[PDB]
Subunit: 421 residues, 2 copies
């Protein structure tokens, strides 16, 4: 005869004891043992309501608290409610075009874990990278030999920051350069190997010549691929970011011609502001030197599952060959998202300078229940944006280890009324 456990919890002992008495009274006439076990665990999660009030003064905290009491909305108040069943959590690492001049500088000054990991990553690269990223003009930042190290540095620093706050992903994924960050952070590459890989990836493409274009098209992959027959080796699909969101890449003239035919057929196209035709045949000339670098490195099994841009499903095996193809072939981002939802991921946290990947993922997900969060936003200062993303996440059930930010030593002496609960 199988034993069944009924787990009860309450605030204070008398309430625990009362709950037990009532549960027994209710159960006296009969219930399923294991049915009642489930009910006890899922009722408890679904009942929990949460809020966070955030301000830089007591006056501000008080106002947001009063608003919550009265059932009002307010700036600095986030609130929500856990689901019965808690879903899995993925980090999404940003790609090209995300970078903005001065990114990271506010967070650096305010968040010592982020600062320390950022310094460490930049030191690994050498070349006075941290200052260049903080100091550099936009044009300098958008040089892809600088861009890819910078994005990698920021994204890995952000990962350590959120990891220090106890937020642990069940999956990681990235877009283009973002994948290299996700790999490093899942333990596939040592930092020195990772920097060597990223440094060469950027530097080798920056040397490629001009005349490449990229155009985003609002159509299906099949619709776009129809047009590529007559333009092999000149144009390719660079990305499939959504069910109707695909990016064409290659020699300018060819790309223009294809784009124009798709626009004649009623489909909207948008030329991207980029230096090179990424993920296209125009990348071919650097690939031999890139393999040479990647072949010198050591590749481990990932500690956390990594979603592949190549396949749109899980990678288990990383090698020099993978990273070379990665550079060349289409980024199957939308398939990646679909894969993550299939594995029960309902929380998506974007690590990177903005919310670009979050909006792309929404093209696939489209559900109010699921949560997609950028950790930084162009709209607000970085410290504020980060702290609000933590608040919002926690409010919807993401485990955040607030104690790591607000240590027990600071509470010593505070007498918080018990009925404060």
């Amino acid at each position: 005869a199988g034993l069944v456990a009924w787990p009860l919890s309450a605030r204070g002992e008398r309430a625990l004891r009362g709950q037990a008495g009532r549960l027994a009274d209710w159960a006296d006439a009969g219930t399923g043992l294991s049915a009642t076990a489930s009910a006890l665990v899922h009722r408890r999660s679904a009942l929990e309501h949460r809020a966070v009030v955030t301000a830089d003064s007591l006056e501000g905290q008080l106002a947001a608290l009063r608003a919550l009491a009265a059932g009002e909305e307010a700036p600095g108040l986030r609130q929500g409610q856990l689901p019965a069943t808690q879903g899995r959590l993925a980090f999404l690492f940003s790609g090209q075009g995300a970078q903005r001049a001065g990114m990271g500088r506010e967070l650096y000054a305010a968040e010592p874990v982020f600062a320390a990991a950022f310094d460490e990553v930049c030191a690994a690269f050498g070349e006075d990278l941290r200052e260049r990223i903080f100091t550099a003009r936009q044009e300098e930042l958008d040089r892809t030999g600088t861009t890819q190290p910078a994005l990698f540095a920021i994204e890995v620093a952000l990962f350590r920051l959120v990891e220090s706050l106890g937020v642990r992903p069940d999956f990681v994924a990235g877009h283009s350069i973002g994948e290299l960050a996700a790999a490093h952070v899942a333990g596939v590459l040592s930092l020195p190997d990772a920097c060597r890989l990223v440094a060469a990836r950027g530097q080798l493409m920056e040397a490629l010549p001009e005349g490449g274009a990229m155009v985003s098209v609002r159509a299906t992959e099949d619709e776009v691929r129809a047009h590529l027959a007559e333009f092999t080796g000149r144009v390719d699909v660079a990305a499939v970011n959504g069910p109707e969101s695909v990016v064409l890449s290659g020699e300018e003239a060819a790309v223009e011609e294809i784009a124009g035919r798709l626009a004649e057929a009623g489909r909207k196209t948008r030329r991207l502001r980029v230096s090179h035709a990424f993920h296209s045949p125009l990348m071919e000339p650097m690939l031999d030197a890139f393999r040479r670098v990647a072949e010198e490195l050591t590749y481990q099994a990932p500690s956390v599952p990594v979603v592949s841009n190549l396949t749109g499903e899980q990678v288990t095996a990383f090698d020099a060959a993978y990273w070379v193809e990665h550079v060349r072939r289409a980024v199957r981002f939308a398939d990646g998202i679909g894969f993550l939802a299939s594995r029960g991921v309902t929380r998506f946290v974007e690590l990177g300078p903005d919310g670009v990947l979050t909006a792309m993922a929404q093209e696939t997900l489209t559900d109010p229940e699921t949560l997609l969060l950028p950790v930084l936003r162009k709209d607000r200062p970085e410290p504020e944006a980060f702290l609000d993303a933590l608040a919002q996440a926690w409010t919807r059930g993401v485990d955040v280890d607030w104690a790591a930010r607000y240590g027990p030593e600071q509470s010593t002496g505070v007498s918080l009324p018990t009925y404060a609960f």
Copy 2:
């Protein structure tokens, strides 16, 4: 101007809103922003009381509940209270010692995650190990060529089971062979590399000749190294008081009588060979040969070393060879774990012998030391009771992974 967040939680919206209004009333007269953030985190945690009633019938469940209601104790009832600061959690993996014939079989039949991982590990050794371990007589078990793969298989299976229920360690540690299971599980070895290493470790030392003894002693490490040539060594430093010597039978007997003459207790161990002694030296060259063929990764989770009694981040063939030869500094490792804020120690093994050893080092009531399996109890009951007790003291168990949501549909709990 730094932003500060105050996180509030409650049961239902009405209560959350009421708690907010009372917190503001309290705070109006002044209070440190970040101080109040900490207090909110920690005091909320400190308050939570938990219990678990476990039985195989309704009658049992009801009685245990009525006992809880009245404040009494009862079979099937566990109960406790979270601490303010949730301490860190370590897994302790058992060394050869209390392996028992038929170990794992009950758990195999009742827990599919444990079954699948056990099958997988045994298949990786091959050679009908899975049939061997359940089937085997105690003496068969005791042959280290058998013992070490078996223990490794059981301990890795238990880890996957505990992991499937959401219990995740911040550190792992092992005694002797236990360290190999801990290393594999922290991702240092592939499974095929791991079984190859443990298969060889066991077989090579089974083939060593008779004539080795081990004795455990009730006295400090310093006191024992005094009464030490190259015939006998320290095999382990389990507790501040307790240590183990190992080596040539005659020499060991000699050092033992001599410490017994000084009024301190000694205990002859029932072992096949003199582990972690000079008597291991003849296998070490062949063992290095096997180890040097393998690939060693950086650990995903911090691993505590038997060699040093602190963390290791570097594993190679050389490490494992020295590991075999030199003393197991278990007590130091336990001390190291406490130093890092570990307050929850769960032993993954056939029996809870390790928990007792650790207990030597740690005497606080607040610290929790739990074996997951118990001799004298059915394994499924033992495993369930360890879960219940752990959760009750704040270890985060994912109960939903055992009792899924689909079974709750239709049940209306009392409000």
